[PDB]
Structure 1
């Protein structure tokens, strides 16, 4: 069921929401990462595939797991925002990859409150994500996300 990588540009920030690959489909998974210019993957699901080929090719993989269709715990959101600004500081231009299971869930969520932290209005965050990827966030995580508010960390 696993959908194609979707880029979200706003800010001059660029996120790629992806599916979790297999080790078989891994070659092509790396290859759309280098097409989109992602040098950093943030995995937030279970560990399924080996990370050492990817940083062999110069992509850092960051494991910040939180559970199926839960909102990000506070540690996770803060780490997320800070990694994002550090990486978009280090080179302007590049992509940060995020993926959970199928890119229709937690990873869009982290993209979303990244966008809100950038001071896009809230439902213009959901707006923007659901145009490109329909029906992405569930229940608890958009309930989560309006009771979220930015002190504009980006």
Structure 2
């Protein structure tokens, strides 16, 4: 459970909960004040229970070692533009399945789009994950050209 924050954004990168640890997972997400959870991997748990706690779940999966399309980058980036202005001091959670995987990839994106050079972003995240990002993914982030349309 790595937490990273920059400017007015604050993300939580967690592990896919088990069908049996789902009640605590909530209890925790609630603690960190997360109001949204984006699953960039396979979905393996009934969310009706999570949604009932006011924590909407988004499913924008994208193949590992494969850049998260363009539709996802847009929606995600836009989700960040709104959510944090919309609900001050809240947290957005992102998770995969085998553990982190590519979650970091979208948070890196928010950071870069947030005016951070890609390396700056990658380093800022490894500060908390250390094993985050693999060679294929680093390449992605390197060639990424930010829209730079997030005001602060």
Counterparts of 1:24 and 1:94, CA distance in 2: 26
Which among 101, 108, 115 is matched to residue 104 of structure 2?
108
Q: List structure 1 runs of 4+ shifted beyond 4 angstroms.
A: none
Partner-residue secondary structure (3-state), 2:5 = strand
Counterparts of 1:43 and 1:108, CA distance in 2: 12
Q: Unaligned regions of 5+ residues in structure 2, if any?
A: none
Give deviations 1:29-72, integer Å, cap 9, x for gaps. Answer: 11110110001000111110000000111100001111233221
For residues 7-86 of structure 1, what are the structure 2 equivalents within 5 Å? 7-86=3-82
Partner-residue secondary structure (3-state), 1:9 = strand
Counterparts of 1:127 and 1:103, CA distance in 2: 19
Q: Would you say the 8 A contact 1:40–1:61 is kept in 2?
A: yes
TM-score scaled by structure 2?
Answer: 0.94
Say if 2:86 is the partner of 1:90: yes
Partner-residue secondary structure (3-state), 1:127 = helix
Cα deviation for residue 104 of structure 1 reads 2.9
Q: Unaligned regions of 5+ residues in structure 1, if any?
A: none
Partner-residue secondary structure (3-state), 2:112 = helix
Cα deviation for residue 20 of structure 1 reads 0.8
Partner-residue secondary structure (3-state), 2:120 = helix
Q: 1:86 to 1:111 in 2, by over 3 A?
A: same
Aligned length: 150
